[PDB]
Structure 1
Amino acid sequence: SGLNIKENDLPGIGKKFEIETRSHEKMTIIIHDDGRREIYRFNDRDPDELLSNISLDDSEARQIAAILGGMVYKPQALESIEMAFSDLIIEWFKVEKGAKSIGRTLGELDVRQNYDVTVIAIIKHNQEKLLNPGADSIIEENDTLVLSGERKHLKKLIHDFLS
């Protein structure tokens, strides 16, 4: 996966965070017990070469975090559901005991056609990651469904086949 972050506990000192971004840029963060934050910027091709170091206290680290975390200025046009589609909701629902969908596939239910709920991915009982479920995907008990739709439409599907 992306954004590798290694966390080591330095005994008597604090926590060390070795970070490598998606842009293959190195960066190390130290968090001392007293709350001090230390940041190290290393070369992209040479981990030995230190390009920058900075020491901050807890209060200072927060004021920078609040800026970097979009809490002082929220990025307007984010490409997330919460930012773009206000009324869109994703729910991770498990097929309960007395359900009426246990057995039949998605092409045999027409959920997107009937409930306006689109299934994105499925975690079945044997933890087999199902990337993009199709019309010929069987639905067993204890399977986890990653759904997409409106609050009203999701509850309708839950009330019927899911729960």
Structure 2
Amino acid sequence: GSGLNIKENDLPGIGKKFEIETRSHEKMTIIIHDDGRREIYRFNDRDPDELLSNISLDDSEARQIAAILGG
């Protein structure tokens, strides 16, 4: 369906994983590590096995980018 869909999973001892599907039907996974590290993975719209891009951010970077993204 076409709305914002977020699936959250605990990664025991490691952090939290968020799998997001947007209204534009684009796919992203965000891992938030307990130590502060953020990892974002972008996958091919129609192929989960195909990684388009990925980025690792420390805590301060993630918060700065989040401030921009969300106003």
Q: List aligned pairs for 1:54-69, cutoff 5 A.
A: 54-69=55-70
Normalising by structure 2, we get a TM-score of 0.95
Which structure 2 residue ranges, 5 or more long, are not aligned? Answer: none
SS at match of 1:24: coil
Radius of gyration: which is bigger?
Answer: 1
SS in 1 for 2:49: coil
Distance 1:45 1:2 in 2: 17
Q: Deviations over 1:13-42 (max 9, x none)?
A: 100000000000000000000010000000
Aligned partners of 2:34 and 2:40: how far apart in 1?
15
Tell me, in whole angstroms, the C-alpha distance in 1 between the residues paired with 2:55 and 2:63.
14
In the alignment, the residues of structure 2 paired with residue 23 and residue 55 of structure 1 have an alpha-carbon distance, to the nearest angstrom, of 24
Query: Which string of whole-angstrom CA distances, capped at 9 and with x for unpartnered residues, describes residues 81-119 of structure 1?
Result: xxxxxxxxxxxxxxxxxxxxxxxxxxxxxxxxxxxxxxx
Count of matched residue positions in the alignment of Structure 1 and Structure 2: 70
1:11 shift after superposition: 0.5
Could you list the per-position Cα deviations for residues 140-163 of structure 1 after superposition, in whole angstroms to 9, with x for gaps in the alignment?
Answer: xxxxxxxxxxxxxxxxxxxxxxxx
Measured in 2, the distance between the counterparts of 1:55 and 1:48 equals 19
- Deviation, 1:2, is 1.4
1:46 equivalent in structure 2: 47
Percent identity (aligned): 100
TM-score by length of 1: 0.42
CA shift for structure 1 position 3: 0.4
Question: Which secondary structure does the structure 1 equivalent of 2:48 belong to?
Answer: coil
**Structure 1 unaligned spans of 5+:** 71-163
**Structure 1 residue runs of 4 or more that deviate by more than 3 Å after TM superposition:** none
